[PDB]
Amino acid sequence: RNFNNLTKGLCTINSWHIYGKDNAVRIGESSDVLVTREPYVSCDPDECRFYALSQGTTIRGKHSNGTIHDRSQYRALISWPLSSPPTVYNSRVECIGWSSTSCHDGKSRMSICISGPNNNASAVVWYNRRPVAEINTWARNILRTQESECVCHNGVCPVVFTDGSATGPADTRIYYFKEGKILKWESLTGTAKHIEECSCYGERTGITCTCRDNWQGSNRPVIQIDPVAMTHTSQYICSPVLTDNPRPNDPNIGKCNDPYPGNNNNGVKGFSYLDGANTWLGRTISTASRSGYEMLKVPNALTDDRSKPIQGQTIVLNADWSGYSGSFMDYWAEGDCYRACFYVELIRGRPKEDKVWWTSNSIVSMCSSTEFLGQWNWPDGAKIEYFL
Amino acid sequence: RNFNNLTKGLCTINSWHIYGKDNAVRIGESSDVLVTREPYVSCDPDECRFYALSQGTTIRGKHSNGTIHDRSQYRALISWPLSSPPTVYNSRVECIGWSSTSCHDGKSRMSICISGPNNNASAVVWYNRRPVAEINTWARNILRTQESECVCHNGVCPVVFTDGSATGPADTRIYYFKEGKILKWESLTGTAKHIEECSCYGERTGITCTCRDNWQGSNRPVIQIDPVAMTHTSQYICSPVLTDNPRPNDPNIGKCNDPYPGNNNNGVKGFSYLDGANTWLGRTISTASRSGYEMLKVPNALTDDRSKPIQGQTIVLNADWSGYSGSFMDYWAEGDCYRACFYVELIRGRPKEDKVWWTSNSIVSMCSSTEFLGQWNWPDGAKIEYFL
Amino acid sequence: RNFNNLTKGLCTINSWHIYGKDNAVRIGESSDVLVTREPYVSCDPDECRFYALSQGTTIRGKHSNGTIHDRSQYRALISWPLSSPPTVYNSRVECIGWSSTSCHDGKSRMSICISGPNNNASAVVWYNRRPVAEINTWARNILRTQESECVCHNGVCPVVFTDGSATGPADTRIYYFKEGKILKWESLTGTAKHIEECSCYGERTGITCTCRDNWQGSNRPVIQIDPVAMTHTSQYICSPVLTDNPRPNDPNIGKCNDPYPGNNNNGVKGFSYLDGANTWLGRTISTASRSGYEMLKVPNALTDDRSKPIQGQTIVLNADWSGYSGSFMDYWAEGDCYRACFYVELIRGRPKEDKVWWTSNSIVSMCSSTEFLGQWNWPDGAKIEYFL
Amino acid sequence: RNFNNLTKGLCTINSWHIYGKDNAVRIGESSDVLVTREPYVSCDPDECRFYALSQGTTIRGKHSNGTIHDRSQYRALISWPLSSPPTVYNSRVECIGWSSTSCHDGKSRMSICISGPNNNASAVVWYNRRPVAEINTWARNILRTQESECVCHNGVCPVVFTDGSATGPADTRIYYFKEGKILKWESLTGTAKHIEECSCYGERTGITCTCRDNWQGSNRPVIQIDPVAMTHTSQYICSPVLTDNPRPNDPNIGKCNDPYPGNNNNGVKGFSYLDGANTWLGRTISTASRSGYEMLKVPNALTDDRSKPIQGQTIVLNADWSGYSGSFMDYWAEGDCYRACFYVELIRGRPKEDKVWWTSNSIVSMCSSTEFLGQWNWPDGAKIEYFL
Ligand SMILES: *[C@@H]1O[C@H](CO)[C@@H](O[C@@H]2O[C@H](CO)[C@@H](O[C@@H]3O[C@H](CO[C@H]4O[C@H](CO[C@H]5O[C@H](CO)[C@@H](O)[C@H](O)[C@@H]5O)[C@@H](O)[C@H](O[C@H]5O[C@H](CO)[C@@H](O)[C@H](O)[C@@H]5O)[C@@H]4O)[C@@H](O)[C@H](O[C@H]4O[C@H](CO)[C@@H](O)[C@H](O)[C@@H]4O[C@H]4O[C@H](CO)[C@@H](O)[C@H](O)[C@@H]4O[C@H]4O[C@H](CO)[C@@H](O)[C@H](O)[C@@H]4O)[C@@H]3O)[C@H](O)[C@H]2NC(C)=O)[C@H](O)[C@H]1NC(C)=O
Ligand SMILES: *[C@@H]1O[C@H](CO)[C@@H](O[C@@H]2O[C@H](CO)[C@@H](O[C@@H]3O[C@H](CO[C@H]4O[C@H](CO[C@H]5O[C@H](CO)[C@@H](O)[C@H](O)[C@@H]5O)[C@@H](O)[C@H](O[C@H]5O[C@H](CO)[C@@H](O)[C@H](O)[C@@H]5O)[C@@H]4O)[C@@H](O)[C@H](O[C@H]4O[C@H](CO)[C@@H](O)[C@H](O)[C@@H]4O[C@H]4O[C@H](CO)[C@@H](O)[C@H](O)[C@@H]4O[C@H]4O[C@H](CO)[C@@H](O)[C@H](O)[C@@H]4O)[C@@H]3O)[C@H](O)[C@H]2NC(C)=O)[C@H](O)[C@H]1NC(C)=O
Ligand SMILES: *[C@@H]1O[C@H](CO)[C@@H](O[C@@H]2O[C@H](CO)[C@@H](O[C@@H]3O[C@H](CO[C@H]4O[C@H](CO[C@H]5O[C@H](CO)[C@@H](O)[C@H](O)[C@@H]5O)[C@@H](O)[C@H](O[C@H]5O[C@H](CO)[C@@H](O)[C@H](O)[C@@H]5O)[C@@H]4O)[C@@H](O)[C@H](O[C@H]4O[C@H](CO)[C@@H](O)[C@H](O)[C@@H]4O[C@H]4O[C@H](CO)[C@@H](O)[C@H](O)[C@@H]4O[C@H]4O[C@H](CO)[C@@H](O)[C@H](O)[C@@H]4O)[C@@H]3O)[C@H](O)[C@H]2NC(C)=O)[C@H](O)[C@H]1NC(C)=O
Ligand SMILES: *[C@@H]1O[C@H](CO)[C@@H](O[C@@H]2O[C@H](CO)[C@@H](O[C@@H]3O[C@H](CO[C@H]4O[C@H](CO[C@H]5O[C@H](CO)[C@@H](O)[C@H](O)[C@@H]5O)[C@@H](O)[C@H](O[C@H]5O[C@H](CO)[C@@H](O)[C@H](O)[C@@H]5O)[C@@H]4O)[C@@H](O)[C@H](O[C@H]4O[C@H](CO)[C@@H](O)[C@H](O)[C@@H]4O[C@H]4O[C@H](CO)[C@@H](O)[C@H](O)[C@@H]4O[C@H]4O[C@H](CO)[C@@H](O)[C@H](O)[C@@H]4O)[C@@H]3O)[C@H](O)[C@H]2NC(C)=O)[C@H](O)[C@H]1NC(C)=O
Ligand SMILES: CO[C@@H]([C@@H]1OC(C(=O)O)=C[C@H](NC(=N)N)[C@H]1NC(C)=O)[C@H](O)CO
Ligand SMILES: CO[C@@H]([C@@H]1OC(C(=O)O)=C[C@H](NC(=N)N)[C@H]1NC(C)=O)[C@H](O)CO
Ligand SMILES: CO[C@@H]([C@@H]1OC(C(=O)O)=C[C@H](NC(=N)N)[C@H]1NC(C)=O)[C@H](O)CO
Ligand SMILES: [Ca+2]
Ligand SMILES: [Ca+2]
Ligand SMILES: [Ca+2]
Ligand SMILES: [Ca+2]
Structure with a gap:
């Protein structure tokens, strides 16, 4: 009935607890589970759901062959109930395309999907399950967006888009939407x-x-981003605890205002919670590939170019494949603070496991606890040999 | 709560954006997807859904053999969530038969299904999921109707029916329903x-x-059709941009009041939006077969027998199979105007692909944008060889 | 909110129109469709649903072997959406057992299921999805009930039960329930x-x-049955148009107060609408087996021992298998009268088709029209050879 | 809207009637049924549902191999509609872990799941489908809980946990929750x-x-447990009718305040209803293994160390496999008393049936009747040979 306002601080993060896990690849070995990638989680005021980009085929289906590919006409943003797998029969299509974001403003949900060829892509903005606005490519080079949830304040939902080179300067814009309509956009500054x-x-x-x-x-x-003034700034996480993948080894001095060098033309989607002494960073354990996942408590990581970890938690062992990771919170939960949450995409198949012809993933998700909880590790759990 | 009234004009159509796509044949290679044909889309005040005539078997099921056939006892009008495929487990049966239409009047939905042998068919009119009225064949020769949504104004929902020859003069009637009851019918004039x-x-x-x-x-x-007076007129699209299939090549003078000659005893369901300078026509790209699909902006196509395109958009490449196409709009969307939408049926299997023994389809659907968006193309996406 | 009262007469029946059909055996050849038998249809104030006794296995499942058997521990009354098939994923279990009835009183639904061994069976009466009352066997010989819907008036829902011999005098009781509680029962009279x-x-x-x-x-x-006084009478349909199966040929004088002789120790569930000149009887076409189905207009069939048909309609050809049939109506439909409806069970498999090891069925259902509609025929539609 | 209060006594138990049965293993031979174990039943004010710990694979899936194992990362508490089987498509995940309990307080449901390695496990407490509180292991030895429903009074829901040895003294705590928050916990006394x-x-x-x-x-x-004072006592059932498995033969004097000896380091989850002369105990029929199940009326079993049965009912024959059993009631049913109910887990597969590589179960459930109903027996019903 009313737009959600961001009125709380983050809860104190002393450890992470299991929130959700769908075991999608295990189950999909023998059930009609859709091939996906680029998953995330997002909450409505009455429900939280898993999201991902379908590939328009099941894993056991013959059309799973070739699903390492990023951008086909057969992709769509789907959502499904928390910790269920994304099945043909339980998945709700939010919009059609191969790059997405989605968020609820307290009244209704906005979902955005980009589709098209590399030189002529376009975003369609949906609100309350209807198309409301459209945005054409401005640099004619793979218009693309977040691949995890956006966030709203008093009806205003900012979204970050990029169009242009993946290996040099590109044209990034921050758009500000309300009820699916474009209030304003601005070029990236900072x-x-x-x-x-x-x-x-x-x-x-x-x-x-x-x-x-x-x-x-x-x-x-x-x-x-200030969603009231509709303005933004940008920089880098100052900390020498580097969190992209692949990446160099951790130095003792990071970089606040420029890229830390060593690895070019590659990366992985990731996240952090930047909150002074309550700061936690996520990263793959491996510096070379998308394997393992850990959280590290790094005080003032955003602003302190010497900052190092004082606590941590392993989420996925280095022996197990990970992938994309991103942030979300249940803005509609009870209490005095917002509980930080995240998901990790657990990629199976190509390119790392090429005895199968497909690429898919499952999801694991955690939220923060004020307790100091014991840690487990959370692999995808599927045996590739079963698919041969 | 209240009957919808048609109080708005069409939004300005400057391009078309992706609205929905179910990838039904791709997914049905390995999941329980019903064989269909003659699909469409129709909106309720709170949801838009895909519709089609099931064949009462899945694609992988052995009963898919022979589904090129038009009129069996195993057909039914089904609906299912937007952009999901029509599965055994998610499809809602609206009524039983082999020719249909359906529309929401703002309060409840009317669905009409025709069944029977060629010489003794009958329509059953359902309203709010209950049978309300029935209409017997008047010419004893395949009583048949729209195969896409009807439209309502202040409770009155006109529907066009034909009974009689497919290759000569037939008996067409326009019926006017309210809450499923017959207010009036009239023979075709014009x-x-x-x-x-x-x-x-x-x-x-x-x-x-x-x-x-x-x-x-x-x-x-x-x-x-004037749904208030409950009267109608008829003619042809005057434009020399011909839009049936198969069809002759485009001349420079069309015909307003008579058939443009060259192809007899054949055709395909199609659509247009006729709105002066905002006029757009849909057609297959091929003049010979149901392949490809394009939209063409043809100013005053309805009334100008010299009218030619000034803009266009490819929807499906000529290399890919298309099929039926039809119009629908979300009459319950926010804003000052109604956004034109359409679907294209993408037929796979027989008669064009006879290495399989079935005939089915998937759906792609677009709505108009006031932006000039880049274009992609939208194939069914299934590989026939996988079904062999 | 209020109990339904029976305040209307039957609509004039001039023909029958298609209402529902699930094609369950066709679809179940390749999807997870439950083996059933003894189906029926019953309406809630907001929805009508199919009902049947599951056998606790799918048709393609290996446990379908032996499903000709009537009374196992693996049976249950299930319901599912109108004209969908009864699938593992869409079927709602109403209660556990091998003989059932169910009806809505306008406020909530009562469902009754009987289970147990032949000499120790018991009925459990459910109301608003909770068990409310139980009835133990009184003759210790296969306590059994209607296998189609009961009917309610001002909260009182009478149900007919039999316990005792299938081949001689048995102990029949009429129970009167309200909100699942036993108001009264009486022994059969008449x-x-x-x-x-x-x-x-x-x-x-x-x-x-x-x-x-x-x-x-x-x-x-x-x-x-008078549901207000909670009393009843009994007799036979007087008409020489005999409607059990198997049965002798039609004589010219029927029997009002005694069995018409010729066939012993056998029968099939059936139905009629007895309404003076608006009387219609259902029966199998064959006098020997459960094949074919027809409706016959037989004026005053209940009371006139010379009555013969004056109109009819074929529902299922004699060449096709039928089975059980029963009555239901949508008591919550709009209008001045109740529209008579019925279903026919279309049995496939054993004993008549013994190349498969299972027994199941599909459903076809019709309701009456005041029009004189053309007739079709409605086979199950499955090819037995596909299951071999 | 209001918290449920425990204001009624138990209904008089004179026999047991069938309540639910899912036939999950039969159906799972050919449909996408999840492997489970440790099932139970629990009611909301408007619905009762089956619950269990999934193993994150279907039975026919290759990942069913090894599911005898108790504690993997692929387990979750799921719920699904009463008497349906737990399928990939109908199961709702309540939380992630390998030991659980769940209960509705009249307003919302609390669910608790424990996960982690043996030495570092943690409980996450969910309320109204959101994580609210967390509890870390206190003895670092397989923190574990009820595996059936908890019970609430005026918002307070007590739960019993154990951490420590399975073969010697352990650390048991009773926690008292309200809206998912910890009000109090206490160490076991008595x-x-x-x-x-x-x-x-x-x-x-x-x-x-x-x-x-x-x-x-x-x-x-x-x-x-007194949920108002939030205090408890403990002892043993005094009766010589012993109800653990495995167990010695029944003596003539039981033990009220100490273990009755004969079998060490083993057991099975079970239940009883302790209500003076209305006391009924459940147990396996076999003293050696988890086979058979019976109910026995044993007056004052809690307090009388000489008490013996005066009535009974067989639920599952000794020839058939049983397993865990537990109590639940529909606290929201109409009437003057609470109707006692229970479920029995029917385990199939390993270790007893080792020709298959999996372990799963189905469910049967009964509630009490004031009638003296005839008894049947209720096997799982699946044929193991079909899975070979
Ligand atoms: C049951 O569960 C519980 C809860 O989960 C388990 O307890 C957890 O155990 C884990 C594993 O040990 C801990 O995670 C690690 O945390 C440390 C940080 O804590 C340590 O250091 C703190 C800071 O010390 C500094 O300040 C203090 C001030 O006093 C000073 O005295 C000290 O000398 C130093 O100056 C200490 O405060 C802290 O002590 C506290 O906690 C202790 C328990 O942990 C306790 O005993 C003490 O009493 C006190 O209370 C403690 O010493 C992280 O540093 C560590 O993360 C590093 O290591 C892991 C590998 O294990 C690696 O993956 C990480 O990436 C990271 O190391 C990389 O990055 C570094 C930063 O650049 C770099 O320096 C490293 O060389 C390394 O870099 C290399 O690898 C990376 C990754 O591949 C690569 O990118 C680089 O290029 C390079 O190749 C862990 O996160 C939890 O904190 C702990 N939780 C709790 C609540 O205790 C418990 O074990 C379980 N029980 C059982 C039986 O299993
Ligand atoms: C990124 O995406 C964007 C957005 O989608 C892409 O841009 C789109 O590009 C497509 C493809 O080119 C365009 O579709 C075509 O549109 C033209 C119409 O526009 C042209 O003509 C207009 C009218 O000109 C007349 O009036 C002007 C007045 O000044 C006069 O000067 C002129 O001489 C003439 O008298 C022009 O106004 C217009 O110019 C404007 O737009 C230009 C960009 O398009 C721009 O550069 C200009 O500055 C200006 O702004 C332009 O010249 C359609 O005619 C065409 O459709 C025909 O051709 C296709 C094949 O491509 C065919 O399938 C169609 O059926 C049709 O041709 C058939 O029918 C004709 C009519 O009877 C017939 O004459 C033809 O011979 C042909 O008939 C044959 O085939 C059919 C079908 O099989 C058969 O039935 C017949 O029997 C026979 O066999 C296209 O629809 C879009 O409009 C354009 N969109 C936008 C917004 O720009 C962009 O390319 C993408 N970028 C990249 C890098 O990929
Ligand atoms: C398009 O669809 C429409 C709508 O569906 C189709 O039209 C329908 O056509 C069907 C098939 O013909 C009709 O069903 C039959 O109806 C007759 C009853 O109607 C006839 O008889 C009426 C009574 O006549 C008596 O009174 C009049 C008073 O004037 C008197 O004059 C007359 O001599 C006699 O005394 C007539 O009123 C009626 O005429 C009216 O309707 C005519 C059209 O039908 C029309 O032309 C007239 O102008 C007038 O308006 C008409 O003559 C049923 O008798 C018949 O049912 C019997 O036959 C079928 C086989 O076809 C059988 O299965 C039935 O069981 C039954 O016969 C068995 O039982 C009898 C009773 O005991 C017994 O006597 C029989 O020997 C037989 O018994 C044997 O078989 C059974 C079963 O196996 C076994 O149990 C026994 O033991 C024994 O072995 C049909 O139901 C529809 O009524 C008709 N509907 C309409 C609205 O017209 C149309 O055909 C379709 N169009 C096309 C092109 O396909
Ligand atoms: C249709 O359905 C109905 C309803 O279900 C069926 O009727 C049911 O039939 C079953 C099966 O017979 C009954 O269950 C048994 O109940 C008896 C208890 O009732 C008997 O005993 C009562 C107490 O007697 C004492 O007090 C009286 C006071 O007057 C005194 O006179 C008497 O001498 C004695 O001192 C009697 O009151 C009662 O009589 C009443 O009911 C009669 C009908 O049952 C009726 O005829 C009478 O008129 C009167 O009304 C009756 O005699 C339970 O004892 C029994 O349970 C034991 O036996 C089963 C095996 O059958 C076993 O599995 C149980 O575990 C248990 O025996 C074990 O434990 C004992 C206790 O420690 C031990 O002593 C035993 O040696 C044995 O222990 C061994 O095995 C266990 C398990 O493996 C192991 O752990 C041990 O270590 C050891 O190895 C049954 O539960 C139902 O009560 C009855 N229901 C009703 C309502 O009637 C009907 O049959 C069906 N019809 C048809 C045609 O099929
Ligand atoms: C082209 O690669 C981009 C994205 O790369 C990733 C990945 O696994 O690394 C998959 C995304 N796939 C999808 N979202 N479908 C790509 N993003 C797109 C739009 O292809 C990358 O960030 C460089 O610009
Ligand atoms: C025993 O046969 C009775 C019922 O027979 C029919 C049938 O196909 O003829 C199936 C029913 N099957 C089920 N309802 N499950 C039986 N009825 C029962 C209770 O077995 C018959 O009416 C004689 O008493
Ligand atoms: C370790 O065994 C415990 C539980 O044992 C049972 C069983 O079938 O006997 C399965 C449970 N499995 C699950 N709940 N998953 C175990 N409980 C646990 C936590 O493993 C036992 O009570 C001893 O402490
Ligand atoms: Ca990088
Ligand atoms: Ca034509
Ligand atoms: Ca008989
Ligand atoms: Ca023990």
């Missing part, structure tokens, strides 16, 4: 030099997005 | 010489239907 | 000599049940 | 010497839990 796939969360201070620099940087760029 | 499978939409001016002349014409007949 | 599987409907005059005499009669017994 | 897997029910006197002593006892420990 010191971030390349922006992709922002993972965002909101709290009383404003909206914070942790993104992927695909060009030169292995530190992560950050965009901080 | 200059259209053969009428089948009308695709309709409504706006403040009245209801406009673009139909199929199966006898002599390769231009499309148009019926214009 | 001239009916054996009662099984009553098919009932209600109108302003009271409740009329047409049953099966399994002992000596090939005419059908009738029980007429 | 004479019970080992506590696992409590089965609880509530009535006006308070909450009664019947548990499993896995250390030395083959009588069952009982915890009696």
